[PDB]
């Protein structure tokens, strides 16, 4: 009767796009592990070495998305990033954190 995901999103990747932006991408959890329709994703992130070290979350990302751009980040700062799935009932577990750093370089 579990109706929440028992597994995290898969193949989590993070790429720095510019001085304040990171593109986070993922794959849904294995279908059998979902225990219901996944209705949203959320992406949490936390600076390792920044001025703001609080955990932030982008919540309510639609189920069809396989990537999201985190914006407004600190320059030259490293972040832990975790993605999690949710059913209508509640949240699933987060992925194992991926570490990504913003930098001066811009991907054109």
- Rounded Cα distance between 79 and 49, Å, is 8
End-to-end alpha carbon distance in the chain: 48
- Rounded Cα distance between 6 and 45, Å, is 21
Class of domain 1-108: mainly beta
Chain centroid to CA 17: how far? 15
Structure determination technique employed: X-ray
Cβ atoms of 71 and 21 closer than 8 Å: yes
HEC string of the chain equals: CCCCCCCCCEEEEEEEEECCEEEEEEECCCHHHHCCCEEEEEEEEEECCCCCCCCEEEEEEECCCCEEEECCCCCCCEEEEEEEEEECCCEEEECCCEEEECCCCCCC
Each domain of the chain, given as residue ranges in start order, spans 1-108
Bridge-based pairing of strands 67-70 and 56-62 is unpaired
Resolution of this model in Å is 1.5
Cβ atoms of 8 and 85 closer than 8 Å: yes
């Amino acid at each position: 009767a579990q109706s929440t995901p028992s597994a995290p999103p898969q193949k989590v990747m993070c790429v720095s796009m510019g001085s304040t932006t990171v593109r986070v991408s993922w794959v849904p959890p294995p279908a059998d592990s979902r225990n219901g329709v996944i209705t949203q994703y959320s992406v949490a992130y936390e600076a390792v070495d920044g001025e703001d070290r609080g955990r932030h979350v982008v919540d309510g990302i639609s189920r069809e998305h396989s990537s999201w751009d985190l914006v407004g980040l600190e320059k030259w700062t490293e972040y832990r990033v975790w993605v999690r799935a949710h059913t209508d009932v509640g949240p699933g577990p987060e992925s194992s954190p991926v570490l990504v750093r913003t930098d001066e370089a811009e991907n054109l």
